[PDB]
Structures are given as C-alpha cells and as structure tokens.
A paper describes a structure:
Sirtuins are increasingly recognized as deacylases with isoform-specific acyl selectivities, catalyzing removal of acylations emerging as posttranslational protein modifications, such as succinylation or crotonylation.
xSirt4 yielded well diffracting crystals in presence of ADP-ribose (ADPr). The xSirt4 overall structure shows the typical sirtuin architecture with Rossmann-fold domain and smaller Zn2+-binding module, with the active-site located in between them and harboring the nucleotide that is well defined by electron density. The loop is oriented deep into the catalytic core and contributes to the active site lining. It is lined by residues from α4 and the preceding loop (86-ArgArgProIle, Glu93), α5 (Ala100, 103-ArgTyr, Arg107), and Ala199/Asp203 from the Sirt4-loop.
Author numbering: 30 to 315
The structure:
C-alpha cells in the first residue's frame, strides 16, 4: 500500500530519539507526506510507492492553472472525483501523538507541508499549514475563502450527469482522468464576485506568502530543538526550515524511512515507520 519498505526499527535509534526529546522543552516540528502514508495517503517520493517514483503523474503548474480555463477544468474535474475519498481519510497514531505532545506543553509549534487536513482533524492547534489545505477554496478575484465541501454540492448541480470512478488518489486528492474524460465539466465561479476559484494550496511554481513564512520563522525563535517527521525535504519550501534551525543552532532530529536532504544536519535519525515510533516517545519518565 502506501508506506515504503523499511528494515525492522532499530531500538538504539528509538532510544536516541527519546534522549533528544527529553532534552527539549519547546519542540518545533515539521511534517511532510510521510506522516500520512499510514492513513492511506500516498507520498510523492518514497522509493517504490511514492507518486513520482511509481507513476508519471505530474503536478499542475500555478501558472497554467491561472492562465488556462482548460487546465482549471482538468484540475477540478479530477479533484471532484477524488474528493469523497480524499476528504474521508483519518489521522493516524503519529498525528494523535503529536497532538498529545501539544496538550502536554512540550510541542511548541508544528508546521506541515501536507494539504490533507489530518493534523487539523487530530486537534493540533499550534499549527501552520505551509502549503495550505485542499479543504479550503479561495477566490483569485476577491480572496474570499470558502469550504471545499460546499463547492462539491455546487459541482453536482452544475454537472448533473457526471460520473467517473476514482483511480490513483494522490497526496492532494487528485485522481487520474483523461483530457477527453474532463473536457465538458463546468466549474462554479465565486458567489461573491464571479471570479476564478482555486483550492487554497500552494501549487508547484507558486510561493508561500512572505508574511506567513516570516511568522513561522518567528515561532522557531523560541524553540529549543527541531524534529522532522516524514519529509524528504527535497522541496526547498520545507528544507529552508531545517536550514533555519541550523542557523539558530537548534539540535535537529529526523524520523523518516528514507534519506532526507537534511540528514547531514541531524544529531539523530530514526529510519522507521513514524507510527511505530512516536507512541513510544515519552514526555514524563516512566
Ligand atoms: N510512515 C512513514 N514513516 C516515516 N517515514 C515515511 C513514512 N512514509 C513515508 N515516509 C518518508 O516520507 C518522506 C515523504 O517525502 P516526500 O514524498 O518528498 O513528501 P514531502 O512532504 O517531503 O513533499 C514536499 C512537497 O512536495 C510536493 O510537491 C508537495 O508540495 C509537498 O508538500 C519520504 O522521505 C519517505 O521515506
Ligand atoms: Zn470572488
């Protein structure tokens, strides 16, 4: 299924990660798509199983969505089909345990690259969604934000004879459809202004808002350590925060099955399934 192959977890790494967490009172956590593979959502870059390893799916480019009605129709028809399954995924034990650490006052702040809403479903409050969330829709004309669930209803009224089955769900809820399968589909406009609606996610080629990025960096200034969970950090948007931790001289730990771009920066690396390991990390001696 969606989790990449990994050797049995090594208990000495687990013990090293524990010693790391025990020394932190204000943990800054970064997560990527690897935290959600145990929920049934594929990641992008896992050897063998990741969308880009195993398939020839290609990300939509920001520029193309913005400049082409036909691209927007393609994008939304696929998103439509994928939405009932994508929106139904549930948080796993890794999401839950990170929420426990927050409750315990040990997690200072968590940034995610994921768009799946799973940390929100788990109850994580001290959260930044770096790349947005597919559960939100924004208008490119007026910047009004609405719920993607409400858009589903609008798609059904506009496209009453639409059916296709959902095939190859991606980490952003996209499913494959052919250009002829999607050719007819009609996209609802903004109810306030009539402008073009976009999911409130940072597509390839877009950039994260600078004020938002700055505000996350501000949260980092109070942390005393960084943990990265389930990201290859091959995408600069995420890797810059590990670079920032190193500039702040924070110790860095990584819980990730494959290699990451920040491996060179880590004090501790646990190559294991995150859901196997996080439940064992304790916040109180026991
Ligand atoms: N259960 C697991 N436990 C631990 N590690 C895991 C697990 N499942 C997978 N991994 C590891 O999880 C890691 C997943 O890495 P990648 O697939 O690059 O996802 P990203 O979140 O970093 O992608 C960043 C952006 O790229 C996109 O364009 C979007 O914009 C994304 O937001 C691998 O190293 C796996 O070994
Ligand atoms: Zn509008």
């Amino acid at each position: 299924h969606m989790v990449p192959a990994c050797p049995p977890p090594n208990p000495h790494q687990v013990e090293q990660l524990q010693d790391f967490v025990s020394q932190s009172q204000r943990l800054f956590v970064m997560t990527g798509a690897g935290i959600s593979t145990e929920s049934g959502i594929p990641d992008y870059r896992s050897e063998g199983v990741g969308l880009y390893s195993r398939t020839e799916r290609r990300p939509i480019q920001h520029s193309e969505f913005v400049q082409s009605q036909a691209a927007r129709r393609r994008y939304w028809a696929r998103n439509f089909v994928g939405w009932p399954s994508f929106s139904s995924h549930e948080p796993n034990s890794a999401h839950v345990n990170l929420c426990k650490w927050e409750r315990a006052g040990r997690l200072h702040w968590l940034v995610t690259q994921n768009v799946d809403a799973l940390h929100t479903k788990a109850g994580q409050c001290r959260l930044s969604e770096l790349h947005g969330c597919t559960h939100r829709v924004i208008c490119l004309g007026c910047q009004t934000v609405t719920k993607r669930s409400e858009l589903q209803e609008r798609f059904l009224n506009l496209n009453p004879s639409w059916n296709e089955q959902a095939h190859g769900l991606a980490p952003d809820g996209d499913v494959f459809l052919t250009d002829e399968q999607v050719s007819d589909f009609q996209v609802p406009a903004c109810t306030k202004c009539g402008g073009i609606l976009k999911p409130q996610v940072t597509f390839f080629g877009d950039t994260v808002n600078r004020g938002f990025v700055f505000s996350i960096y501000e949260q980092m200034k109070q942390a005393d350590a960084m943990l990265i969970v389930g990201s290859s950090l091959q995408v600069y948007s995420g890797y810059r925060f590990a670079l920032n931790a190193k500039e702040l001289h924070l110790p860095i730990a990584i819980l990730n099955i494959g290699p990451t771009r920040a491996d060179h920066l880590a004090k501790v690396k646990v190559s294991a399934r995150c859901g196997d390991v996080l439940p064992h990390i304790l916040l109180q001696d026991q």
